[PDB]
Amino acid sequence: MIISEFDRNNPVLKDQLSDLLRLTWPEEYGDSSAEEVEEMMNPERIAVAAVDQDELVGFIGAIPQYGITGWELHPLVVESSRRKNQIGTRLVNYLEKEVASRGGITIYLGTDDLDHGTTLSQTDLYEHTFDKVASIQNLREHPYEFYEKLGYKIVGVLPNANGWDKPDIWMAKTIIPRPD
Amino acid sequence: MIISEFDRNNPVLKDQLSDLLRLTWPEEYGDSSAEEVEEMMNPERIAVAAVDQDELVGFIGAIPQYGITGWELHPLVVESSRRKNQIGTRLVNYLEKEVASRGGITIYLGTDDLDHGTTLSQTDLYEHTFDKVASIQNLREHPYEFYEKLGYKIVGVLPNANGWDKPDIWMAKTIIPRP
Ligand SMILES: CC(C)(COP(=O)(O)OP(=O)(O)OC[C@H]1O[C@@H](n2cnc3c(N)ncnc32)[C@H](O)[C@@H]1OP(=O)(O)O)[C@@H](O)C(=O)NCCC(=O)NCCS
Numbered sequence: 001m002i003i004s005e006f007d008r009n010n011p012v013l014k015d016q017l018s019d020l021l022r023l024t025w026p027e028e029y030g031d032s033s034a035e036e037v038e039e040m041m042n043p044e045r046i047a048v049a050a051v052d053q054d055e056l057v058g059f060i061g062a063i064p065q066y067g068i069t070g071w072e073l074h075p076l077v078v079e080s081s082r083r084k085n086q087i088g089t090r091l092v093n094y095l096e097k098e099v100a101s102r103g104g105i106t107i108y109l110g111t112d113d114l115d116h117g118t119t120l121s122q123t124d125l126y127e128h129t130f131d132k133v134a135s136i137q138n139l140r141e142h143p144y145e146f147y148e149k150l151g152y153k154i155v156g157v158l159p160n161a162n163g164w165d166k167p168d169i170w171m172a173k174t175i176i177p178r179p180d
Numbered sequence: 181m182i183i184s185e186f187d188r189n190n191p192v193l194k195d196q197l198s199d200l201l202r203l204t205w206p207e208e209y210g211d212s213s214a215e216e217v218e219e220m221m222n223p224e225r226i227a228v229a230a231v232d233q234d235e236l237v238g239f240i241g242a243i244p245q246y247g248i249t250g251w252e253l254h255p256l257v258v259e260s261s262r263r264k265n266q267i268g269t270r271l272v273n274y275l276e277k278e279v280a281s282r283g284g285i286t287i288y289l290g291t292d293d294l295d296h297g298t299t300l301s302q303t304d305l306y307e308h309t310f311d312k313v314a315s316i317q318n319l320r321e322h323p324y325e326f327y328e329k330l331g332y333k334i335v336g337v338l339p340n341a342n343g344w345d346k347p348d349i350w351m352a353k354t355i356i357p358r359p
């Protein structure tokens with residue numbers, strides 16, 4: 001299958017994206033699902049799709065949050081039935097090329113830990129904040145490790161973001177060579 | 181000088197807010213300044229202002245970003261001629277109370293360093309990241325210290341956010357006692 005820029009004018013494709021988002025995150029994409037999809041189609045954003053034949057199996061987007069330099073990776077979803085076969089890796093790498101081409105320097109993201117997937121949850125993060133970040137361990141195949149393998153680093157945490165001891169984990173990667 | 185809920189239907193107050201935002205952050209607030217002000221009026225957000233008889237002297241807002249438990253403090257501004265008189269402190273204190281009333285647990289913010297205002301800028305933040313964060317110093321009266329004095333702690337940094345060696349500094353505070 002191929003990874004390419006998402007055709008913002010393809011009703012069918014946009015429908016599959018909506019479903020994929022609703023299925024994956026039913027609590028986050030219930031009503032305004034097709035609506036948030038349109039939000040992801042914004043010209044200022046980047047929208048990359050993974051299509052097998054004619055089926056959308058993965059999608060990744062990026063939002064410019066700091067001028068043209070800092071972008072937020074959001075969202076990233078791969079059909080639960082097509083995971084573990086480099087689709088996510090290929091989507092992230094394609095996104096990075098697209099961001100760089102627009103003058104982007106860094107991409108960051110927030111990956112939450114709501115069900116004790118890592119050692120950063122179920123603990124007071126204001127205590128030994130960064131020692132805990134540095135010694136993080138993946139307890140339940142939390143996706144933060146997916147990003148680490150792609151070169152992203154945990155650069156921060158948001159204590160009790162989603163409720164007591166259910167933090168958001170901030171990760172980032174600078175995608176181009178540093179002026180030398 | 182009464183710090184209270186911002187009147188979201190007052191067009192004149194909104195124009196002053198728009199003005200204050202363009203004077204404080206001319207790079208972030210330009211032609212579409214009125215639009216950005218309307219976004220701050222969204223029903224889910226908290227909007228609080230310090231008003232002296234008729235002049236808008238300060239404004240603070242908050243956005244629920246994680247359910248209703250995690251809120252981003254944005255924006256916060258006090259007229260230059262009125263600073264260092266506790267108006268900022270009072271705006272934040274008032275906001276924290278209102279956020280808590282709405283179910284908030286944590287308030288966070290991102291304060292950028294674009295002009296070597298702290299030791300975190302003008303250096304490759306990917307080398308000894310947390311060592312540098314741990315020994316941060318305030319070089320040009322950067323506002324991160326204002327938040328630190330109010331109980332906020334640096335919980336993260338985004339290297340090269342605004343361009344090489346011009347990071348964003350993430351700070352946060354849990355506003356209610358831990359059960
Ligand atoms: C996380 C996700 C996007 C990864 O997509 P994918 O196509 O399955 O990932 P890939 O096959 O490209 O994985 C590449 C590498 O990352 C690792 N990896 C992937 N998901 C992982 C996880 N949850 N925990 C640990 N490692 C993981 C793989 O083992 C592989 O490592 P290896 O090369 O050493 O074997 C996908 O599983 C998904 O859709 N998850 C749910 C959505 C989500 O929570 N996203 C996080 C955004 S906040």
Ligand SMILES: CC(C)(COP(=O)(O)OP(=O)(O)OC[C@H]1O[C@@H](n2cnc3c(N)ncnc32)[C@H](O)[C@@H]1OP(=O)(O)O)[C@@H](O)C(=O)NCCC(=O)NCCS
Nearest residue numbers: 256257258263264265266267268269291321322323325326
């Ligand atoms: C940052 C700002 C809101 C502070 O408002 P303020 O009314 O001047 O703050 P206060 O007078 O309540 O300050 C309380 C304490 O913080 C300190 N403080 C305030 N601004 C500070 C700064 N920039 N650097 C260091 N300390 C600062 C005060 O000295 C005082 O300390 P003390 O209690 O030890 O005497 C104001 O300067 C402002 O509007 N700045 C421009 C916009 C901005 O940068 N906003 C921050 C968003 S990231």
